[PDB]
Amino acid sequence: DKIKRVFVFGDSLTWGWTPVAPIVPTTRHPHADRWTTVLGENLGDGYELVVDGLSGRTTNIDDPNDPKLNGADYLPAALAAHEPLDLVIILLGTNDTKTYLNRTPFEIGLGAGALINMVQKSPGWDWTDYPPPPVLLISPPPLGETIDPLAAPIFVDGLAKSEALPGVYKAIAEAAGESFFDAGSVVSTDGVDGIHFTAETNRTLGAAVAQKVKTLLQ
Amino acid sequence: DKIKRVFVFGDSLTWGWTPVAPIVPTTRHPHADRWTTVLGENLGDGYELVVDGLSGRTTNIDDPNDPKLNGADYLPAALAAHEPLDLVIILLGTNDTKTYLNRTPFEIGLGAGALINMVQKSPGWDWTDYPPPPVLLISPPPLGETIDPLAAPIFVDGLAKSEALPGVYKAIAEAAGESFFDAGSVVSTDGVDGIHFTAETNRTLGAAVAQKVKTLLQPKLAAALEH
Amino acid sequence: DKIKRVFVFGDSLTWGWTPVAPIVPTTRHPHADRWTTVLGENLGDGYELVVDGLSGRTTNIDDPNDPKLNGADYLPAALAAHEPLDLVIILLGTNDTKTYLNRTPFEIGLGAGALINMVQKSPGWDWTDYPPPPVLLISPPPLGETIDPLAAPIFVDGLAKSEALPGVYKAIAEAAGESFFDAGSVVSTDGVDGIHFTAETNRTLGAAVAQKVKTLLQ
Amino acid sequence: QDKIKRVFVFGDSLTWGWTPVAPIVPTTRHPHADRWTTVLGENLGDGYELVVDGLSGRTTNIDDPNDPKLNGADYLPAALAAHEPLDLVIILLGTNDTKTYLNRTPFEIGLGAGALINMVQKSPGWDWTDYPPPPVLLISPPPLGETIDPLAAPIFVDGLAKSEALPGVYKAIAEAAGESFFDAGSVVSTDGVDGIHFTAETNRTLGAAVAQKVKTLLQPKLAAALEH
Amino acid sequence: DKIKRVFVFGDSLTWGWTPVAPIVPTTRHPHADRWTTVLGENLGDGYELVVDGLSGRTTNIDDPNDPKLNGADYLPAALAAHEPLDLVIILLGTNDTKTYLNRTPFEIGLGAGALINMVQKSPGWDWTDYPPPPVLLISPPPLGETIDPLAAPIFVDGLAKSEALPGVYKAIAEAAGESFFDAGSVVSTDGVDGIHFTAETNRTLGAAVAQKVKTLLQPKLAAALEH
Amino acid sequence: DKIKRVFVFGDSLTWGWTPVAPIVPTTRHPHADRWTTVLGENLGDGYELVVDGLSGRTTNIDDPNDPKLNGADYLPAALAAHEPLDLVIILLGTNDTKTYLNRTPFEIGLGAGALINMVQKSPGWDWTDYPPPPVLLISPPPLGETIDPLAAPIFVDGLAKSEALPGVYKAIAEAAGESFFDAGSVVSTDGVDGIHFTAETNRTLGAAVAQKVKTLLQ
């Protein structure tokens, strides 16, 4: 019985940012406490995860402060490097609400859409011919109402944008003939810095997403 | 009584490519025969059009054969140059089906979406403050089943892509909270070269699109449609 | 008699910036008061205008504050989109005097030259074969002696540069085998903000430029 | 109790697990059990945990005009930050750099590998974390096959000689960076039928050999005691 | 008296391409036979030359075949590296006529203009304050009527373009308030390959350009002589 | 017997920056006092020099303050323009220690390596066929312990980097099969501004480098 391969593509939430005061520097959640790990455990031996979480990462836009943060710069290579996959999970959009990137929620949806499209056109080549995998686009929960004062200037108007993502993400996913899940339906941003997750929140999300995944793959 | 300004942003279909054999060179449809002109006539004195149709133009992707064909390179400037507008009409996607651009229909939808987004964030500045205008995204009709042999190699698998655009364009438009219309619902690509429109097709399209526009910009009529 | 098509390519002066205090925000001159409109009226039914005026637009240089302001990024597409034309009028150079763009008058001439060249090589293709249209390069008048305090820092040394443009523009136009007209010969920058035009100045310019056009086209 | 050591492997199709076949393409991925990185993992034991990033077609630090995703140096900074903290970075690249159309000398390819080592040394570019940067083991690939699949041969003209020259250059560059080196050509050769990729037998040998090398670097107290 | 420094910025004509059959490979003209050398000899001890001639070099446009051939990529650095200078001579434009670069003569003039402007804004900095030097723009002669068959495909329509350069170069130089000289007024492209110069042609050019230079840098004397 | 041609590619040290207080503006060392000139004199009539020294120039990295300062942008053209050569001397690396470029010594070595590689692949063409010339990579001496207060902010941590260059440069040169010389073995940065050389230091360096050159070329 073929082991099913799931690739998880996200930001610091998926890397395992431990929320702290002051907001930085952080250390990585122990493996046991990462949402992806709990996702893996609840799925069982039938499944095998590959995880790529980058602190600061956006859907598809350059961060003028750091040239390595554009998801869409990286994703084509990542997909080809982990082919073949049975599912691609995308949990991005939190960094896209940063003030200086000046994005609307629809713009952020388009960004997630750009990534879905990269998966659908995945590997760009005749060197292999496995099919492209389906995609589960996950909208993150709303930001915290109170963000660490060091980071707050960079998240002005961010909360309202983050609240609007589930609706947009769902339409975009649907338009692509792919799947959707709102992380805000089962958890919220409970980290002390108003942006990242506690281990308790990771656990809830991992277990919830595992149910959703089994529905799609059995 | 304020005159309503409508900006039309498209490709050769909107420039006025006269279909001919061989496919090139062409000459511009006389003004009287252009779809935008008939659109203007059917709208009346209540409306005033601005038209920007570029042969070869795509939604949001570079053509390696010509650096001036990317709609999204041009649109931000165009919008600011014609502010204030009451509506922006986009009729693009036909060139996006060209084989060498290697686009899926969903990708082309995202391209049209990129343009909608540019309109929604239109002018990027404090120099004026008019609101941004609403958008009517128009999907083109399917390509001809028979394309001029000179152009056919460049439109391989293009037909199927063009057939898939209305569904994608509608979702994208809806997702943006904007409007949609399928040109394929009232006309088809009847030009001899299998890509462009006759004057008869222009006339039909112009008249049909004018009805749609009035629905959006005359609120008494907009109201009546919810009934 | 063929109707003659004239394309006007300019900046906020051609859009119809209404001079006000404070300098921004502005509203667009009513159509009846725009210089291009008066140009059209004085030309008669023999002529038909197409107008493209963008606030902030330069000849051929990127504005680091706004990526849509480079005339030469736009002009090739615009020319092809309005083919066939009988004349192209260019009234640009006022924004090129902005301090942070660091341009000399000769440099600005070269920029206008770049645009003339784009018109001369206009459409780059076999898809149509109309000839390319002739060009009337119009130098703007000198800037106001007193510029709105909000904008003044951005126009340091700009006045002297603007005074030098007619001479340079004339040489460049002549070198290209094309025509020239100095807007400063018939009007000056009388707007309250020291940069833009009143409706009275628009009227004078429109009527003067119409005389010049008829000389070129009969 | 002892913290588990994290080793990141950054390579090309050799590291992805290209199964050599005729005709050369299309291929399928070596079963997990037969990948060199997997055997590397098994020979290391529970003391170690691998993260593997192998991309078919990938170069050290140069754009492939045929595919914009193949430049290792475009990807590596992000990858490093995404897998921090690491105890070692292994780089096994250079085989694609010998492709005719990229027009590279062996020294140039060394510089490319050097660019990657430098990215690791300056790894994460930020105050968001402060773990140290990890050491690097640069691995030179073996020489190409003398006979390359006719479909691919035009793109590997003069490639063999370049591949033979890589160990020398890679060693100097690694040494200059104060990092480690290993020549895959010292324990295996390109035995795949297409003249470019590896059989499962060759993967096994390489995995086991590289595991010895890794333990020398990360348990040096033990390595020391063993030598006498 | 300060010794006057003259910087010569050109292409293979200034490097010293020896015309041969077949066209390539060539070897460099002996120093004694280079036009710049004869220029130096005819100027005397009052002057000192610095020479930068690159085979294949254009005014201001990328050659898709070789990324090092754009004069304007190089000139800012070169100017600062040889500061202070009393004159900059530019003899470029021959490679700009190459078919695949698709340039008009006016465009090539603008390219030369771009270089003049770089000289006028020369060093961009506080680190020194010498004045910027004046410029003598030199138009090359027309291409040969017969070009080596290996190179001919790359110089289609090139002859006519090269004939048009003197007029354009003069206007552009004048517009910049700088000087002009037409190499075609005293020599032509007599090399066997139809592109480069013999030693005899170099000698003529060197001596002619030296007269022109002295006019510019000893202008009080030039003035007094004109009677 | 060939007259032997030596091309010297460097920064302000090779241009002839006269150290002064305040640090800027400077004037060029008289020709008689330049290190390259003394190099030429000590070599004799058997040799002929070509010199390209640009104030501010780096090995292979863009200076965000000035787009003309990247050695590797310039070197390919320079090499082809002065072919044929018998030797290329590179004395660069002092500007690479500037704080804002954020380079490690190994990175700077790689930069020098990039230049060596350009020389080894020199002219990229069939238009001539002379061989490529050998290369003598020269590491500069350590910076001054005391730098002009106006320039010091830009050379923080630069001293330590400059001290590390000889070791790195030697490895890189050796790896390329080329030659090396440490300018710090015969001189130090004795200019009043803590960065540039006096005429006395130029003389010492010129004479020392001439010995080295003769060893390589006979």
- The domain limits of chain B are 4-226
Specify whether the CB–CB gap between E88 and E16 falls below 8 A. Answer: no
CA-nearest of D66, D38, D33, D61 to D51 is D38
Quote the tokens at residue A204.
Answer: 């809830």
| Residue F106 to residue D122, Cβ atoms within 8 A | no
Buried b (16+ CB within 10 A) or exposed e, D188-202: bebebbbbbbbbbeb
**Per CATH, which fold does D5-217 belong to?**
Rossmann fold (3.40.50)
Chain D residues with beta carbon closer than 8 angstroms to that of F176:
107
Report which residue type is found at D155.
I
| A24 φ, ψ (degrees, to nearest 5) | -130, 150
Q: Which of E96, E102, E117 to mutate to test the interface with C (most CBs of C within 10 A)?
A: E117
Specify whether the CB–CB gap between A93 and A59 falls below 8 A. Answer: yes
A7 touches D at CB < 8 Å: no
Q: Which 8-state DSSP code applies to residue F8? A: E
Question: Which residues have C-beta within 8 Å of that of residue B213, sequence separation ≥ 6?
Answer: B6, B39, B43, B47, B87, B89, B136
Q: Which candidate from E114, E120, E172 shows the least CB-CB separation from C104?
A: E120
Neighbours of chain E (3+ CB pairs under 8 A): C, F
Question: Which chain B residue's Cα is nearest to C85?
Answer: B28
Helix (H, G, I), strand (E, B) or coil at E29: coil
- Give the CATH number of domain B4-226: 3.40.50.1110
Strand B87-91 with B4-10, pairing? parallel
Q: How far apart are CA A160 and CA F133, in angstroms?
A: 64
Query: How many beta-carbon pairs below 8 A join chains B and C?
Result: 73
Q: How far apart are CA D60 and CA D71, in angstroms?
A: 6
Specify whether the CB–CB gap between F142 and F161 falls below 8 A. Answer: no
Contacts of A151-154 with C-beta under 8 Å, sequence gap 24+, read A151/A23, A151/A193, A151/A194, A151/A195, A152/A194, A153/A99, A154/A98, A154/A99, A154/A100
Q: Which candidate from F104, F114, F174 shows the least CB-CB separation from D121?
A: F104
Query: How many beta-carbon pairs below 8 A join chains A and B?
Result: 44
CA C126 to chain centroid:
29
Q: How far apart are CA D35 and CA B16, in angstroms?
A: 59
> How close F144 comes to chain D (CA, Å)?
25
Q: Is the peptide bond before D143 cis (omega within 30 degrees of 0)?
A: no
CA B158 to chain centroid:
17
Q: Is the peptide bond before D167 cis (omega within 30 degrees of 0)?
A: no
CATH class of the E4-225 domain in this structure: alpha beta
Chain C residues with beta carbon closer than 8 angstroms to that of B26:
127-128
Cα atoms found within 13 Å of the Cα of residue E109, Cβ hemisphere only:
33
CA-nearest of D181, D180, D161, D141 to D58 is D141
Quote the tokens at residue D52.
Answer: 């593997």
Cα atoms found within 13 Å of the Cα of residue E14, Cβ hemisphere only:
30
Question: Which residues have C-beta within 8 Å of that of residue F95, sequence separation ≥ 6?
Answer: F11, F56, F57, F58, F63, F69, F101
β-strand partners of A181: A138
> CA-CA distances (angstroms) from residue E223 to B164, E135, E210, E218?
78, 19, 16, 9
Specify whether the CB–CB gap between F79 and E66 falls below 8 A. Answer: no
What is the number of other CB atoms lying within 10 angstroms of the CB of residue D158? 11
> How close F4 comes to chain E (CA, Å)?
13
Would residue E43 be called left, alpha or beta, if left means φ above 0 and alpha means ψ between -120 and 50 degrees? Answer: alpha
β-strand partners of D8: D51, D89
Sequential DSSP letters for chain D: --PPEEEEEEESHHHHTBPP-SSSSS--BPPGGG-HHHHHHHHH-TTEEEEEEE-TT-BSS--BTTBTT-BHHHHHHHHHHHH-S-SEEEEE--TGGG-GGG---HHHHHHHHHHHHHHHHT-S-SSS--PPPPPEEEEEPPPPPSS--TTTGGGGTTHHHHHHHHHHHHHHHHHHTT-EEEEGGGT----STTSSS--HHHHHHHHHHHHHHHHHHHSHHHHHHHH-
Specify whether the CB–CB gap between A206 and A38 falls below 8 A. Answer: yes
**Stretch 67-126 of chain C: residues touching chain E, C-beta under 8 Å:** 104, 106-107, 109-110, 113-114, 116-117, 120-121
| 3-state SS track over D26-65 | CCCECCHHHCHHHHHHHHHCCCEEEEEEECCCCECCCCEC
Q: How far apart are CA D150 and CA D157, in angstroms?
A: 11
Helix (H, G, I), strand (E, B) or coil at E209: helix
Surface-to-core class of residue E29, CB atoms within 10 Å of its CB (0-12 exposed, 13-18 middle, 19+ buried): buried
Q: How far apart are CA F22 and CA F29, in angstroms?
A: 16
Neighbours of chain F (3+ CB pairs under 8 A): D, E
| Residue B25 to residue C66, Cβ atoms within 8 A | no
Question: Which residues have C-beta within 8 Å of that of residue D79, sequence separation ≥ 6?
Answer: A74, D8, D10, D53
Residue position matching structure tokens 């040239």: A67
Q: Which 8-state DSSP code applies to residue B147? A: -
Q: How far apart are CA C88 and CA E122, in angstroms?
A: 34
| Residue A25 to residue D77, Cβ atoms within 8 A | no
Give the containing element (helix H, strand E) for E213: helix E199-217
Strand B47-53 with A179-182, pairing? unpaired
CA E68 to chain centroid:
17
CATH for the F4-217 domain, from 3.40.50.1110, 1.10.10.10, 3.90.1150.10, 3.40.50.970: 3.40.50.1110
Would residue B102 be called left, alpha or beta, if left means φ above 0 and alpha means ψ between -120 and 50 degrees? Answer: left
Quote the tokens at residue F163.
Answer: 């001290």
Cα A202-A204-A207 angle, rounded to 5 deg: 105
Specify whether the CB–CB gap between F21 and F199 falls below 8 A. Answer: no
CA-nearest of A76, A116, A7 to D70 is A76
User: How many residues comprise chain F?
Assistant: 218
Helix (H, G, I), strand (E, B) or coil at B64: coil
CA F179 to chain centroid:
14
Q: How far apart are CA D29 and CA E39, in angstroms?
A: 68
CA-nearest of A117, D152, A132 to B102 is A117
> CA-CA distances (angstroms) from residue E165 to E54, F73, F183?
20, 29, 49
Q: Which residue stretches of F97-195 are H helix?
A: 105-120, 158-175
Q: Which 8-state DSSP code applies to residue A70? A: B
Cα C62-C68-C69 angle, rounded to 5 deg: 55
Helices and strands, counts by H and E, chain B: 7, 5
CA-nearest of C79, C98, C190 to C144 is C190
> How close F55 comes to chain E (CA, Å)?
7
Specify whether the CB–CB gap between B56 and C127 falls below 8 A. Answer: yes
Do E and F touch (≥3 CB pairs < 8 Å)?
Answer: yes
CA-nearest of F84, F90, F46, F98 to F72 is F90
Chain F residues with beta carbon closer than 8 angstroms to that of D105:
117, 120-121
Report which residue type is found at B199.
A
Helix (H, G, I), strand (E, B) or coil at C61: coil
Torsion of CA A77, A81, A83, A89, to 10 degrees: -60
Helix (H, G, I), strand (E, B) or coil at F129: coil
Quote the tokens at residue A77.
Answer: 């290579």
| Residue A127 to residue D25, Cβ atoms within 8 A | yes
Buried b (16+ CB within 10 A) or exposed e, F73-107: bbbbbbbbbbbbbbbbbbbbbbbbbbeebebbbbb
| E182 φ, ψ (degrees, to nearest 5) | -100, 105
| Residue B175 to residue A171, Cβ atoms within 8 A | yes
Q: How far apart are CA C40 and CA B221, in angstroms?
A: 35
Q: How far apart are CA D194 and CA D188, in angstroms?
A: 16
Q: How far apart are CA E204 and CA E35, in angstroms?
A: 8
Chain E residues with beta carbon closer than 8 angstroms to that of F50:
none
Specify whether the CB–CB gap between A15 and A98 falls below 8 A. Answer: no
Strand C47-53 with C4-10, pairing? parallel
> CA-CA distances (angstroms) from residue F198 to D43, F40, F144, F194?
61, 18, 13, 11
Would residue C102 be called left, alpha or beta, if left means φ above 0 and alpha means ψ between -120 and 50 degrees? Answer: left
Quote the tokens at residue D17.
Answer: 């697990």
Report which residue type is found at F217.
L
What is the number of other CB atoms lying within 10 angstroms of the CB of residue F31? 12
Cα B94-B98-B99 angle, rounded to 5 deg: 155
Surface-to-core class of residue F191, CB atoms within 10 Å of its CB (0-12 exposed, 13-18 middle, 19+ buried): buried
Chain C residues with beta carbon closer than 8 angstroms to that of E59:
none
Q: How far apart are CA C75 and CA C135, in angstroms?
A: 13
Q: Which approach determined this entry? A: X-ray
Quote the tokens at residue F133.
Answer: 């010339």
What is the number of other CB atoms lying within 10 angstroms of the CB of residue B113? 29
Query: How many beta-carbon pairs below 8 A join chains A and D?
Result: 73
What is chain F's alpha carbon radius of gyration, rounded to the nearest angstrom?
A: 16
What is chain D's alpha carbon radius of gyration, rounded to the nearest angstrom?
A: 17
Q: How far apart are CA D190 and CA D206, in angstroms?
A: 11
Specify whether the CB–CB gap between D141 and D94 falls below 8 A. Answer: yes
Question: Which residues have C-beta within 8 Å of that of residue C175, sequence separation ≥ 6?
Answer: C113, E106, E109, E168, E171, E172, E175
Q: Which 8-state DSSP code applies to residue C58? A: B
β-strand partners of B121: none
